[PDB]
Amino acid sequence: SRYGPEYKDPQIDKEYYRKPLAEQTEEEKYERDFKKTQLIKAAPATKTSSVFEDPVISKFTNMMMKGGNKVLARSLMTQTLEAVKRKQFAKYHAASAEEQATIERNPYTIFHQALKNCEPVIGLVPILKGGHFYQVPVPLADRRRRFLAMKWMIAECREKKHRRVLMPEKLSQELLEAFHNQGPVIKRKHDMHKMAEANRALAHYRWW
Amino acid sequence: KNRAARVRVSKGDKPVTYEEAHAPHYIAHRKGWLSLHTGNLDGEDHAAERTVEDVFLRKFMLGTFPGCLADQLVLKRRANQLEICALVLRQLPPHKFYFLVGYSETLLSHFYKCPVHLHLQTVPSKVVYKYI
Amino acid sequence: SFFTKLTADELWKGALAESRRKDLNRGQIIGEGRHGFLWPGLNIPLMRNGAVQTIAQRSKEDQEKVEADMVQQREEWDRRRKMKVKRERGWSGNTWGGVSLGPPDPGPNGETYDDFDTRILEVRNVFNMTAKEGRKRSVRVLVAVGNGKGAAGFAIGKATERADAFRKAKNRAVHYLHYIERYEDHTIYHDISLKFKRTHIKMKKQPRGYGLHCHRAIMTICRLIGIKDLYAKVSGSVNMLNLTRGLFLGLSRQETHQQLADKKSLHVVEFREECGPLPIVVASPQGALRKDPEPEDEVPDITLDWEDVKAAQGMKRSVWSGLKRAAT
Amino acid sequence: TVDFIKKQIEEFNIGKRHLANMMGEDPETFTQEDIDRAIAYLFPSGLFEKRARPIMKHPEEIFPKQRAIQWGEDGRPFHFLFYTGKQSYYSLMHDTYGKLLDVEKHHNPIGSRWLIKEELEEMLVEKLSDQDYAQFIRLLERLSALPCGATEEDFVNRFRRSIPXXXXXXXXXXXXXXXXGMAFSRGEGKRKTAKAEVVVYGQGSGRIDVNGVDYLLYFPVTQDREQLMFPLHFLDRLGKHDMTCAVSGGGRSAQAGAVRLAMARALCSFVTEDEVEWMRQAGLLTADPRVRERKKPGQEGARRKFTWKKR
RNA sequence: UUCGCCAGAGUACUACUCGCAACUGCCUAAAACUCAAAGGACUUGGCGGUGCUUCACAUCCACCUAGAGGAGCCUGUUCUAUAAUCGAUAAACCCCGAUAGACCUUACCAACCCUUGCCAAUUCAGCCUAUAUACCGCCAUCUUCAGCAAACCCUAAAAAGGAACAAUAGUAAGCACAAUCAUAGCACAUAAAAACGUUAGGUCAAGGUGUAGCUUAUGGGUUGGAAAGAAAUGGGCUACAUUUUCUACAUAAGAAUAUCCACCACACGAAAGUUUUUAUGAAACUAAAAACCAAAGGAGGAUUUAGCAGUAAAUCAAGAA
Ligand SMILES: [Mg+2]
Ligand SMILES: [Mg+2]
Ligand SMILES: [Mg+2]
Ligand SMILES: [Mg+2]
Ligand SMILES: [Mg+2]
Ligand SMILES: [Mg+2]
Ligand SMILES: [Mg+2]
Ligand SMILES: [Mg+2]
Ligand SMILES: [Mg+2]
Ligand SMILES: [Mg+2]
Ligand SMILES: [Mg+2]
Ligand SMILES: [Mg+2]
Ligand SMILES: [Mg+2]
Ligand SMILES: [Mg+2]
Ligand SMILES: [Mg+2]
Ligand SMILES: [Mg+2]
Ligand SMILES: [Mg+2]
Ligand SMILES: [Mg+2]
Ligand SMILES: [Mg+2]
Ligand SMILES: [Mg+2]
Ligand SMILES: [Mg+2]
Ligand SMILES: [Mg+2]
Ligand SMILES: [Mg+2]
Ligand SMILES: [Mg+2]
Ligand SMILES: [Mg+2]
Ligand SMILES: [Mg+2]
Ligand SMILES: [Mg+2]
Ligand SMILES: [Mg+2]
Ligand SMILES: [Mg+2]
Ligand SMILES: [Mg+2]
Ligand SMILES: [Mg+2]
Ligand SMILES: [Mg+2]
Ligand SMILES: [Mg+2]
Ligand SMILES: [Mg+2]
Ligand SMILES: [Mg+2]
Ligand SMILES: [Mg+2]
Ligand SMILES: [Mg+2]
Ligand SMILES: [Mg+2]
Ligand SMILES: [Mg+2]
Ligand SMILES: [Mg+2]
Ligand SMILES: [Mg+2]
Ligand SMILES: [Mg+2]
């Protein structure tokens, strides 16, 4: 907010800048962009042009940080990706050739998958009518859903571990079980879905 | 509502001195300081004395020069001597003015044990900054 | 404790308490003192026959005398503050009705009226409802002005401070003047019966010895117009404003002898009782005097006011009517 | 008030001489530029508002313009539109409309703007209303809408103004060192209590030195090294350049960011004129305006307040 | 032109009469007594669990984060107790006047004492005594709200109102907002500012005063003594542990880790206490540090507080007295 409304966001992707020549409306557009003498924001410190940056991992990284510890959250995440990695190597070498073709060794694909699979389709909002609060079925916008998945994973592997158990480990377990849909996280997604199905009549109430 | 050193808006007829028309938040922005001395700078001593001293010279000049004082009284301290400037209204016949000049300078000089210099600038009527 | 004390003004603010003022700046000269020193530049001129008088001290008794002088000064000022109560009364006591407000203000064009008297007809405290303040108090005065020579008018004015409002009505009232046509420069021309908004005005044209018998307001207005002889009774609501509006409409409603003559093209002839049958002409029809006599009905058809006819036969028995009252 | 202007301009010149002779300059070439220096040295007011500082100026800049005498000594007014109460406005209007009419009988993005409302108010020496201004400008659009004559164009030029626009990241010419005969560029970034300076040598081993130690050791936090990597990975120069670095103030992330700015600044000598606008749109060369906000008294954290109690 | 109806308001579509297929009925219809009014229409406000539009940007809802209510402790009120201050006490009190009480401060209680008893002079001093609903001072509050207000002008009358921009009666300098200043260049942000009034809001204990009271005392001194907890509650601090605890250390380490079991107890948590020192000081009741001890607490009912970005949250250091 030390930025006036005059300052537009930085677009940080390099592939965009290096290879413009085949795109007309985008050539027009970024021409408008810098030609407008557009005051543009100092790019954040978390966003980098690193080839290794996955925005989803960043968000999930943040939401795990208590206080101001980037260092610590970064480390816990790193250890989670790592933990899943090694756990999947262990599953690989102890398996049969068919399953060697099957198994996912990429902790990243495992992560985007275990989140795609944990995200609820519909969710509830309370509506006040005639004195009572009814929980009613609301279709959700994607970002809210992503958030719900991540929030759930973090809250689940935060709360229910036995104290001798480190975060990255349990988190890895929950990731791999949510991968196969058998994990408690998905039990949660399902209790959402069931609660929505029971109240489906009340989907009349919602006016928007 | 800040009441500090302020002069309220009247029916609009009230005469106001440039100083009394500029509210406390304005010091060092438009208004200046009524006194000057070294004492409040970073490394400096005896600020308090020049404050008591100043106060007493406000009361003193208001009392020695009745009804003839125009605007608040401007003190300067330079290398141990006081330079006291006053805006003074013309009421008195000039003899009395010089009587009180000598009277003041002498009396003060012997009170504060440092040489005092006095200046009267005479004005026909209180300057009006606003309203009127 | 010299440090604890303050300026005079502050003390008077916090004495008076507006959230009478006496001044201590009055009577004391420079160098004036109780220990009685005569200072060469202040108490005494700087020089005598011999130059440069020295610093001198008066006697015990010379000081007792100067002190007596200041004491008698204060006494004089207190008496002068108490003697400040004097007034001329308008109608009754604290009623501002009929009070002389003093000639209106000279306009922008140098136009000056020293000839115009003003009288306050009605001063009234009026209130309003302001979200901020609760009640809000205005004063409204209805004021009339006239030179005695037949032109006069009135206006209303309203302000928070009543003084302000007296002023306002003055000036606004010079802006509305009527010319009021007087017969032989005292009465009205003919009787006027005029109903105006719930108030009835009725006025009979008197002969000369009969000064101004009227509602107190209408007396006031008729002294400002210069009408010296009138009978006027008022019916219905007496409220001041409707009354003066009514009266002014009515006295401008007047049909003059010249105009009567002109529309009827005949001579108009005053028959005095004191002068017997002598057929005094008042007005002549400039242009052609008609050769035509006018119908004399045994039976005229006119609105007749029951009050006048009741008067006529001796049927007004009210003990209030025939009263002696003070001069006009 | 005109007698005041005559008098004041006279005394202004007499005081002008008086100023020059004491200040000891030739009274002839004395300018306003010199007037300022003069008073500023004679009556040195530290004061923040600059209008309340001492002024000696030509009365015309001191005083407001005046509306001239509007009627002869007979009472009779000069301008025929006088009774409109704005003659100044409606004269412009009459003329404008006349111009238009004549154009209709005859006819059979440079950075130029119309006046502000305040500028038309200055031009006519007349208070204005928004509506009025709007009306007029509307009319000038009608004027531009048709075939444009010579005097037509001059006319609308009166109400024309021109504005500057400047955008380029200022390009430092490189600097070739005498010792190796080699070219370098020295940048300065500043972020949030932390300033950094970065000298970049155009022929590198990839070496990056910070305060006399290696960059890995000075930024054990990986995140920081990534921030550092940003400009170089952007311009694909990662091994090509050799940087020396001096940074001070603040904590680690602040430092890594200052080095980001300084480096990305020192990298625009060795880059192409085109990649510059990219680094702008990447937001590399723009400072971070974000800083700590002072606690406020009676509060907690500049924003955080003491817990509020309804009862 | 006629007829019928009205002489303050209640009392009273009532009490008594008269007449009626009514017999808690209809019709006709008073007075005692009480009051200085009772009524109609309007005017600005304010208000509305009326209707309609448009918003809320820490903000009501939905949403995000971190907490309060539970525990220990700190500290403030409220009550009980005391011979033993005052003031604040819905939003706008409650780590508040205090950026600060061992003596002092100090106004309090307990005893003793002194009477032109600070000053140049005064049948004069001195009063933290009663009035904040007499006040000036300083502020709170609506409020980051846009209005306040003189001077005029208009309204088949004016209590009051006064705009429509292809404009229909409004003009107006002033004070507000805005603008500029400060946060060392811009910009935004924050700071500041924010009238008129409102709450008889706060304060006669900062000081000063109007009115009242005290004058061998409601004045002035010396010596001690107060500030105990059955509770009840406001705000904080530290926790409840693995995103943790310890040591090294600055941000890659090594160990500990609530249950074994008879540990020779340990995991988190002692800010609390008991002991010893030390700092200050004439006087330790005060602060700090070690040694011991290790308790409640295992994430907290109804309900609530705060925050829109370098903010919230966490961490560290400095100053005022
Ligand atoms: Mg404020
Ligand atoms: Mg009387
Ligand atoms: Mg904070
Ligand atoms: Mg009756
Ligand atoms: Mg009935
Ligand atoms: Mg009956
Ligand atoms: Mg009958
Ligand atoms: Mg909130
Ligand atoms: Mg709100
Ligand atoms: Mg809690
Ligand atoms: Mg608690
Ligand atoms: Mg108390
Ligand atoms: Mg008690
Ligand atoms: Mg109390
Ligand atoms: Mg009170
Ligand atoms: Mg209060
Ligand atoms: Mg607090
Ligand atoms: Mg004590
Ligand atoms: Mg006492
Ligand atoms: Mg009381
Ligand atoms: Mg009050
Ligand atoms: Mg007050
Ligand atoms: Mg406005
Ligand atoms: Mg008005
Ligand atoms: Mg600036
Ligand atoms: Mg701003
Ligand atoms: Mg503020
Ligand atoms: Mg402002
Ligand atoms: Mg009160
Ligand atoms: Mg209250
Ligand atoms: Mg007092
Ligand atoms: Mg007193
Ligand atoms: Mg005593
Ligand atoms: Mg004591
Ligand atoms: Mg409790
Ligand atoms: Mg806490
Ligand atoms: Mg370790
Ligand atoms: Mg302890
Ligand atoms: Mg223990
Ligand atoms: Mg336990
Ligand atoms: Mg709530
Ligand atoms: Mg100190």
PDB file of N, CA and C in Angstrom, chain D residues 158-183:
ATOM      1  N   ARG D 158      -4.623  28.768 -27.851  1.00  0.00           N
ATOM      2  CA  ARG D 158      -4.667  29.534 -26.583  1.00  0.00           C
ATOM      3  C   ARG D 158      -4.975  28.653 -25.357  1.00  0.00           C
ATOM      4  N   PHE D 159      -5.902  27.723 -25.564  1.00  0.00           N
ATOM      5  CA  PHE D 159      -6.423  26.830 -24.535  1.00  0.00           C
ATOM      6  C   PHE D 159      -5.700  25.490 -24.529  1.00  0.00           C
ATOM      7  N   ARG D 160      -4.629  25.418 -25.304  1.00  0.00           N
ATOM      8  CA  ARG D 160      -3.799  24.235 -25.342  1.00  0.00           C
ATOM      9  C   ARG D 160      -2.637  24.338 -24.357  1.00  0.00           C
ATOM     10  N   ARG D 161      -2.280  23.199 -23.773  1.00  0.00           N
ATOM     11  CA  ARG D 161      -1.050  23.064 -23.001  1.00  0.00           C
ATOM     12  C   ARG D 161      -0.339  21.786 -23.428  1.00  0.00           C
ATOM     13  N   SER D 162       0.910  21.635 -23.006  1.00  0.00           N
ATOM     14  CA  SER D 162       1.701  20.470 -23.377  1.00  0.00           C
ATOM     15  C   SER D 162       2.403  19.873 -22.154  1.00  0.00           C
ATOM     16  N   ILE D 163       2.425  18.544 -22.074  1.00  0.00           N
ATOM     17  CA  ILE D 163       2.945  17.851 -20.897  1.00  0.00           C
ATOM     18  C   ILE D 163       4.088  16.888 -21.251  1.00  0.00           C
ATOM     19  N   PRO D 164       5.117  16.813 -20.385  1.00  0.00           N
ATOM     20  CA  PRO D 164       6.207  15.838 -20.546  1.00  0.00           C
ATOM     21  C   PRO D 164       5.889  14.429 -20.018  1.00  0.00           C
ATOM     22  N   UNK D 165       6.494  13.414 -20.637  1.00  0.00           N
ATOM     23  CA  UNK D 165       6.489  12.045 -20.114  1.00  0.00           C
ATOM     24  C   UNK D 165       7.861  11.429 -20.355  1.00  0.00           C
ATOM     25  N   UNK D 166       8.482  10.907 -19.302  1.00  0.00           N
ATOM     26  CA  UNK D 166       9.811  10.319 -19.440  1.00  0.00           C
ATOM     27  C   UNK D 166       9.928   8.947 -18.776  1.00  0.00           C
ATOM     28  N   UNK D 167      10.107   7.899 -19.579  1.00  0.00           N
ATOM     29  CA  UNK D 167      10.433   6.590 -19.024  1.00  0.00           C
ATOM     30  C   UNK D 167      11.614   5.923 -19.727  1.00  0.00           C
ATOM     31  N   UNK D 168      12.738   5.849 -19.023  1.00  0.00           N
ATOM     32  CA  UNK D 168      13.831   4.933 -19.337  1.00  0.00           C
ATOM     33  C   UNK D 168      14.580   4.692 -18.040  1.00  0.00           C
ATOM     34  N   UNK D 169      15.054   3.475 -17.811  1.00  0.00           N
ATOM     35  CA  UNK D 169      15.973   3.293 -16.701  1.00  0.00           C
ATOM     36  C   UNK D 169      17.286   3.919 -17.150  1.00  0.00           C
ATOM     37  N   UNK D 170      17.785   4.878 -16.374  1.00  0.00           N
ATOM     38  CA  UNK D 170      18.962   5.640 -16.777  1.00  0.00           C
ATOM     39  C   UNK D 170      20.167   4.721 -16.938  1.00  0.00           C
ATOM     40  N   UNK D 171      20.782   4.768 -18.116  1.00  0.00           N
ATOM     41  CA  UNK D 171      21.868   3.852 -18.450  1.00  0.00           C
ATOM     42  C   UNK D 171      23.235   4.464 -18.186  1.00  0.00           C
ATOM     43  N   UNK D 172      23.954   3.886 -17.234  1.00  0.00           N
ATOM     44  CA  UNK D 172      25.324   4.292 -16.981  1.00  0.00           C
ATOM     45  C   UNK D 172      26.215   3.763 -18.094  1.00  0.00           C
ATOM     46  N   UNK D 173      27.068   4.630 -18.633  1.00  0.00           N
ATOM     47  CA  UNK D 173      28.130   4.187 -19.527  1.00  0.00           C
ATOM     48  C   UNK D 173      29.072   3.319 -18.706  1.00  0.00           C
ATOM     49  N   UNK D 174      29.683   2.309 -19.323  1.00  0.00           N
ATOM     50  CA  UNK D 174      30.499   1.376 -18.553  1.00  0.00           C
ATOM     51  C   UNK D 174      31.757   2.093 -18.071  1.00  0.00           C
ATOM     52  N   UNK D 175      32.575   1.401 -17.288  1.00  0.00           N
ATOM     53  CA  UNK D 175      33.849   1.963 -16.860  1.00  0.00           C
ATOM     54  C   UNK D 175      34.956   0.922 -17.027  1.00  0.00           C
ATOM     55  N   UNK D 176      35.926   1.206 -17.896  1.00  0.00           N
ATOM     56  CA  UNK D 176      37.049   0.296 -18.108  1.00  0.00           C
ATOM     57  C   UNK D 176      38.170   0.610 -17.105  1.00  0.00           C
ATOM     58  N   UNK D 177      38.508  -0.372 -16.271  1.00  0.00           N
ATOM     59  CA  UNK D 177      39.543  -0.203 -15.255  1.00  0.00           C
ATOM     60  C   UNK D 177      40.909  -0.090 -15.908  1.00  0.00           C
ATOM     61  N   UNK D 178      41.809   0.661 -15.281  1.00  0.00           N
ATOM     62  CA  UNK D 178      43.150   0.860 -15.828  1.00  0.00           C
ATOM     63  C   UNK D 178      44.079  -0.328 -15.550  1.00  0.00           C
ATOM     64  N   UNK D 179      43.878  -0.992 -14.411  1.00  0.00           N
ATOM     65  CA  UNK D 179      44.767  -2.066 -13.954  1.00  0.00           C
ATOM     66  C   UNK D 179      44.834  -3.258 -14.914  1.00  0.00           C
ATOM     67  N   UNK D 180      43.683  -3.862 -15.195  1.00  0.00           N
ATOM     68  CA  UNK D 180      43.616  -4.973 -16.138  1.00  0.00           C
ATOM     69  C   UNK D 180      43.201  -4.517 -17.538  1.00  0.00           C
ATOM     70  N   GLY D 181      42.880  -3.235 -17.668  1.00  0.00           N
ATOM     71  CA  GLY D 181      42.311  -2.728 -18.900  1.00  0.00           C
ATOM     72  C   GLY D 181      40.899  -3.250 -19.105  1.00  0.00           C
ATOM     73  N   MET D 182      40.247  -3.659 -18.019  1.00  0.00           N
ATOM     74  CA  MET D 182      38.966  -4.364 -18.111  1.00  0.00           C
ATOM     75  C   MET D 182      37.791  -3.489 -17.672  1.00  0.00           C
ATOM     76  N   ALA D 183      36.619  -3.740 -18.258  1.00  0.00           N
ATOM     77  CA  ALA D 183      35.408  -2.980 -17.955  1.00  0.00           C
ATOM     78  C   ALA D 183      34.589  -3.554 -16.783  1.00  0.00           C
TER      79      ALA D 183
END
